[PDB]
Structure formats: structure tokens, C-alpha cells
Design a binder for this molecule. Structure first.
Ligand code: ADP
Ligand code: BEF
Ligand code: MG
Length: 694
RNA sequence: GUCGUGCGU
């Protein structure tokens, strides 16, 4: 009775967290400020992430400055790199709420749709008396303007005549409120989306009431619980795994608390997660799986679609729900999307009466949609999503409790992101990740200097040794020669027959080999003025030529549906690659080929991988974030059979890591020279250039 | 100095 009441109180407190302080602090920031910190407060306030936290208060005190710094850096990046479409609104009556002012304005529905303004968005508002209506309006004008105020879009209500009543929450003490006179035109432009930041702040505040708060603060995973070897052998036989994976699965399931599995790429980490899920289901209980990147969630959903084996070995297919939008979610698992499942479940005076009937019908449809969504969530056993999406409003409103949580690629997410899914009464958490992989995507170098980029998995590994996996079953041994010898200094043993099972017909051809490094003799990349992202068309052309040659050689012999992937460190480079591939081939690229980034492609598996090195210009003299060993390791660990690296030898040779990689490739005679039309006998210019370079 | 992200009414 009393215990249940306390548990319910804690659950509602964790789900319902006051967001007012977050806005009160963020809204005081100056949009026009050009600095690496939100304010001019002493740097001594910020502190490095402590390995051990005495109490939740200390953890919150340490994390809050880092979270604010990360939010400020993201806001600055959106201000510079992102360029939305500014709009104008008419100021209305202002309502005074707790240390805040809510302003109601009338906006055009078409303008709102074009600008993509939602109820969880942040905007910057300015007063420009000298602005010319004919003159173009952009973020540059806001940067130049000195009167800027941050506002939060609290709600968006559509009124008659296609007019939206936008409510904007701002800080009282901000001086810009003096410009918010009634019937005044204010130019507002979107900045960024605060949903992720809001969820992170809510989790940070509610960590006090989390069941595993003590373990997180102490960073001490529950001690291993000894289990009979018979169970381990039975699990290994049923799931056709190895001894290490079976032992890790048994240890993780047997003991409550935090269980960390550290497995380099290709060591069955995803297969280990699937085995854990199957074993738990065999032994109603709902399990929540969260991955930092949507690609990992899509891969997990695709793998689960094939079925899950139990201890007896029989394969069963549980109901899996993907919490996300169709656009971000992959087309292959589009059926598993929650919205698609809900759609499948159901799918004068006279004018006033007709309007009332239409409104009643719409309300009934909304109620039916809510009921179908609730039924799908309740019946479903596996809920796969992302860390940011794990705190979806629907899940919080439903109130269902997830006693088992899995965090895939825990090293790719910050502590707050990894802890977000634990708000739902998480008593058992299993984190799978390899520290050598890419770190969490942090836009602030200062925050990383304070160990903000450090993930909870890394800290837990430092405190105690996780369950280690040293056997791989994906990467070709030749491909894994260099990554294992350099990054891991060994400790990674290839499978008994990886080479035999990785043999492919195109490997026989000299141009195409399991491992090959192609050099761009003549290649330069242009940095975008706004996004500050490099991009070179030479690598795109070379990749297109390689793909066309591979298809022509083995068009009908072997189908390449979902077997060729191209990873580029730069978003702009990936977008250009996809656009040019669509222009050249057409719709086949939608299925036969995939395009992604190294961080966005982390965890993905493809038979053929093309790693595009954007930094193809020697005059730059800098390789960029690629210099880090984790980036190269993740990029190289994507190929299962064939890996092709495109780049400029001179530019990459400057960095020690790429220099060593090129030397290793030369030792194995895997180095190659490529250019425009280097595989075209007609294009004798390419042959002449190759001969001259040699 | 540039790599990610949350929603569908
Ligand atoms: N015991 C095994 N027998 C055969 N194949 C295995 C075994 N364990 C793992 N594999 C293969 O190795 C691959 C492991 O990939 P994984 O390491 O999960 O990728 P990522 O590191 O991106 O998560 C799987 O695709 C699976 O087919
Ligand atoms: F360790 Be794998 F690259 F997800
Ligand atoms: Mg995995």
C-alpha cells in the first residue's frame, strides 16, 4: 500500500518535471553573443565529470553547467550553420506567469508550415524599425541586430481564417519586452529544437528518484552472480553463440542492476543483445531497447523481424514497436513503426449542424487513434527506439513500467542520454558498447575538455571491468589486420572461417579486392559558406564509376540489394553523393545502395563499404576530426567483405594515423590510384595521368 | 570545426 503509493509518486515526479528553470536560465542568454560560453561567469564554475559522485545534488551541480554549455554551443552552431526562413508576427496581450511572460501573436498558417514551427521549438525575436520589406531577411540580419530575445513556442492553435495563435514564453527581466507593444511587428526566426535538451534536463532533475541512482552515482555495477555452466552451455547451443557471448548473456540476465558488455565491432554485440532479449522473453514483461542513432534502432528492428530464439531453440516472433516518425525510420521497418501499426489497427443552421457533426467525427477518430495506440503499446513486448525518443510523451502519459532496459552503443551517447530511458522504473539495465568507437557527438570542445563527452559506459568500465568479447565474426581477416594490430594492439581474433565465407567473385578482379586504398591524384573539396562542410565531386564520380563497373561485371550474377554502403564523414558530402548517385543510376540507389556518415553509420553492417575521405586537398594541411583514431576505427569496421577507401594520399599522409594506414596498405600492395575515368579505356587522359604519377 | 537528435497533430 504505502510502498505502491511511494512508487507511484516517484514515477509521476520522474515523468512530470518542472521545466521552468531550464527556460529561465537559457532565455537569459544573448542570441547575438559571439562566445564559447553562455555568459561571462568565471570558468572555475565548470568542473570535470567526477568519477565518483557523493550524492545526487553533487551530480546535478556538476552536470548542469556542462548541459547549459552544450545547449549554448548547439544554439550557436544552429545560428551559424543552420539558416531557417525568418518570419514576422504581430505582438498581442502579454500574460504574466511565474518569472515569465507569455505573448500571444497571430501568424499565417502557410508561414508556420513553411518555417516548420512546432510546440517544442525555440525562436529568436528582433525589432527592426529600419528593415525594408522588399529587402531579403535572413539570420545575418538577426546577428547584426542588437535587440534579440529568445522565446519558446509554448503552443500553436489554429483559429478561423487560417490564422495561428502562437504563444511565446520569454523571460520577464529581458529588456526586449519593452519593444513588445500591442499591434507591433516583430521579426522571429527559429533557432533549434529543445525537445532533446528538455528531456535531458528532466532526466537530470529526476535522477534523484531513479531506482539505480545509487549505482549511477557510485558508478559501481552490481557484482557478477555465479551461474551454473550447464545453463551457459545450453544458451550457447540454443543460440549458436560462442562461450564468451553465452557467459556474458547469462551473467547480465542473472544479476540485476547495471551490466556492461564490451565487444569490438563484429563480435556479435547486436547478436548478443538479441540473445539477451530472447532469453529474457523465454524466462507480462516488456523490454525497452534504446540506441543513440536511428540506424542502430533500425538494424535491431530488422534483426528482430527475422525472429527470436528461445532456450529450447524454437524461433518465435514477438510484437515489436518502433517509437519514432516514419521519415527518420528506415523504409524497410516502416511497417514496424508505431504510427503504421495504429493505422492498421483502425485506419446557416444546416451548416452549423454539419460543422458540429464533422467536429464530433474528428474527436471520435482521435479517441480511436488514442485507444489503438494504447492497445499497441500495452500488447507489445519489445519497444525499440532512441535515447532521445525513449522519453516520448506517449510513453510517459501511458505510464507503463519497463523493468528491463538495453542501451546499444552506450559509448556513443552522453551520461544524460543513456540515463533518459531509465526514468521508467528501470531496475535492470544492460549497456553494450565498445570504447574505441566514436564518442558522443558533442559540438563543444570545452565541454569535452570537462569530460562531458565521456559516456556513462566509459565511467562504469573505469570503475569495474565489463564482460569482454575478443572474438569477431564479421570483418574479413585481411581488413581486420590493421584495425586490430593498431587500434586494439591485438586482443581481437578472427573467426575460424571468415576468409572462406567472405570470398566473393569480384575479389578475383584486380581493381576490386577485399581491402583496397584508392588515391585521388587530382581532387579538391570546397567548404560550404554556411554549413562549413567540405565536399569534393571527384570522389563522388570515382565512387559512381566503381559502382557502375561492379554492377556491369556482376549485374545479374549477384544482387546488391542492401549490400553496398557509402560512408562519408561530412553530411554535405553524403548528401551530394546521394544526389549524384540518384541522378546517374536512378531509383536503384534507394535499395541497391545506401549513403550515410561514419557516426550515423556506426553499428551498421554491409557487404561492401566505400569510405569517402572529403579532405582531398593537400593545401589545407589539416585532416580534421578524422585524425582521431575512433573515427578511423568505426569507418574501417563497417566492411564485411570489401572495403574501398577514397582519398588523397598527400593530404592524408600528413597525419600520423593516416600515414601509418597508407604505409600498411603499401606493405600489402593494397594501395591504388584513381581519378576521373580511370576505369574507362576510352578516357586515355586518366591512363596518362596514372602513368605520369607512377 | 564540424560529426547527431526529438515528435505527428
Ligand atoms: N557464433 C556465431 N556464428 C556465426 N556468426 C556469428 C556468430 N556471432 C556473430 N556472428 C556474425 O557476426 C556479426 C556480428 O555483427 P555485430 O558485431 O553485431 O555488428 P556491430 O558491431 O555493428 O553491432 C553478425 O552479423 C553475425 O552474423
Ligand atoms: F562495435 Be560495432 F561497430 F557496433
Ligand atoms: Mg551492435
Amino acid at each position: 500500500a504505502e510502498l505502491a503509493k511511494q512508487e507511484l509518486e516517484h514515477m509521476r515526479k520522474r515523468l512530470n518535471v518542472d521545466m521552468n528553470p531550464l527556460y529561465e536560465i537559457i532565455l537569459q542568454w544573448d542570441y547575438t553573443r559571439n562566445s564559447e560560453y553562455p555568459d561571462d561567469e568565471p570558468i572555475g564554475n565548470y568542473s570535470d565529470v567526477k568519477d565518483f559522485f557523493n550524492s545526487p545534488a553533487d551530480y546535478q551541480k556538476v552536470m548542469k553547467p556542462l548541459l547549459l554549455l552544450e545547449s549554448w554551443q548547439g544554439l550557436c552552431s544552429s545560428r551559424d550553420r543552420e539558416d531557417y526562413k525568418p518570419f514576422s508576427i504581430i505582438v498581442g496581450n502579454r500574460t504574466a506567469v511565474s518569472d515569465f511572460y507569455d505573448v500571444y501573436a497571430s501568424v499565417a498558417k502557410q508561414v508556420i508550415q513553411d518555417c516548420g514551427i512546432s510546440e517544442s521549438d525555440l525562436i529568436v525575436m528582433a525589432y527592426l524599425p529600419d528593415f525594408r520589406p522588399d529587402k531579403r531577411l535572413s539570420s545575418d540580419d538577426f546577428k547584426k541586430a542588437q535587440h534579440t530575445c529568445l522565446a519558446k513556442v509554448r503552443t500553436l492553435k489554429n483559429t478561423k481564417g487560417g490564422n495561428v495563435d502562437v504563444t511565446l514564453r520569454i523571460h520577464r527581466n529581458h529588456s526586449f519586452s519593452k519593444f513588445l507593444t500591442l499591434r507591433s511587428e516583430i521579426y522571429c526566426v527559429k533557432v533549434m529544437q529543445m525537445t532533446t535538451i528538455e528531456r535531458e534536463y528532466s532526466t537530470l532533475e529526476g535522477l534523484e528518484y531513479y531506482d539505480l541512482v545509487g549505482q549511477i552515482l557510485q558508478a559501481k555495477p552490481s557484482p557478477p552472480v555465479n551461474v551454473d555452466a550447464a545453463e551457459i552451455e545450453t544458451v550457447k547451443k540454443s543460440y549458436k553463440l560462442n562461450t564468451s557471448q553465452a557467459e556474458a548473456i547469462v551473467n547480465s540476465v542473472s544479476k540485476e542492476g547495471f551490466s556492461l558488455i564490451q565487444g569490438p565491432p563484429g563480435t556479435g554485440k547486436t547478436k548478443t543483445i538479441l540473445g539477451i532479449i530472447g532469453y529474457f522473453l523465454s524466462t507480462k514483461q516488456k523490454i525497452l531497447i534504446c540506441a543513440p542513432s536511428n540506424a542502430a534502432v533500425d538494424e535491431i528492428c530488422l534483426r528482430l523481424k527475422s525472429g527470436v530464439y528461445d532456450k529450447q531453440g524454437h524461433q518465435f516472433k514477438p510484437q515489436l514497436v518502433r517509437v519514432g516518425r516514419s521519415d527518420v525510420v528506415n523504409v524497410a521497418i516502416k511497417d514496424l513503426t508505431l504510427e503504421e501499426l495504429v493505422d492498421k489497427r483502425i485506419g446557416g443552421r444546416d451548416r452549423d449542424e454539419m460543422r458540429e457533426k464533422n467536429s464530433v467525427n474528428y474527436r471520435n477518430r482521435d479517441l480511436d487513434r488514442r485507444n489503438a495506440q494504447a492497445h499497441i503499446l500495452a500488447v507489445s513486448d519489445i519497444i525499440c527506439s532512441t535515447l532521445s525518443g525513449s522519453a516520448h510523451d506517449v510513453l510517459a502519459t501511458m505510464g507503463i513500467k519497463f523493468d528491463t532496459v538495453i542501451i546499444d552503443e552506450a559509448c556513443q551517447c552522453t551520461e544524460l542520454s543513456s540515463i533518459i530511458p531509465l526514468r521508467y522504473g528501470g531496475k535492470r539495465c544492460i549497456m553494450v558498447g565498445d570504447p574505441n568507437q566514436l564518442p558522443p557527438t558533442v559540438l563543444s570542445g570545452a565541454a569535452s575538455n570537462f569530460k562531458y563527452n565521456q559516456s556513462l559506459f566509459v565511467r562504469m568500465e573505469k570503475n569495474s571491468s565489463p564482460y569482454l568479447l575478443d572474438v569477431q565474426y564479421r570483418m574479413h581477416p585481411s581488413i581486420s589486420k590493421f584495425p586490430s594490430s593498431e587500434f586494439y594492439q591485438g586482443r581481437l581474433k578472427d573467426g575460424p572461417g571468415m576468409d572462406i565465407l567472405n570470398k566473393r567473385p569480384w575479389h578475383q578482379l584486380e581493381p576490386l579486392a577485399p581491402y583496397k586504398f584508392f588515391d585521388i591524384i587530382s581532387g579538391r573539396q570546397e567548404q560550404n559558406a554556411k554549413t562549413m562542410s567540405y565536399t569534393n565531386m571527384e570522389e563522388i564520380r570515382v565512387a559512381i564509376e566503381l559502382v557502375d563497373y561492379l554492377f556491369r561485371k556482376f549485374d545479374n550474377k549477384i544482387d546488391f540489394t542492401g549490400k553496398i554502403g557509402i560512408i562519408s564523414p561530412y553530411r554535405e558530402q553524403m548528401q551530394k553523393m546521394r544526389k549524384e548517385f540518384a541522378r546517374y543510376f536512378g531509383g536503384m540507389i534507394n535499395k541497391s545502395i545506401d549513403f550515410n556518415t561514419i557516426d550515423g553509420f556506426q553499428g551498421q553492417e554491409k557487404e561492401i563499404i566505400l569510405i569517402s575521405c572529403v579532405r582531398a586537398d593537400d593545401t589545407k594541411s589539416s585532416v580534421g576530426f578524422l585524425k582521431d583514431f575512433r573515427r578511423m576505427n568505426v569507418a574501417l569496421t563497417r566492411a564485411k567483405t570489401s572495403i574501398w577507401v577514397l582519398g588523397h594520399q598527400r593530404s592524408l599522409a600528413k597525419s600520423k594515423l593516416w600515414r601509418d594506414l597508407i604505409e600498411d596498405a603499401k606493405d600489402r600492395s593494397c594501395l591504388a590510384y584513381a581519378c576521373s575515368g580511370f576505369l574507362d579505356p576510352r578516357n586515355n587522359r586518366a591512363q596518362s595521368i596514372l602513368r605520369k604519377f607512377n
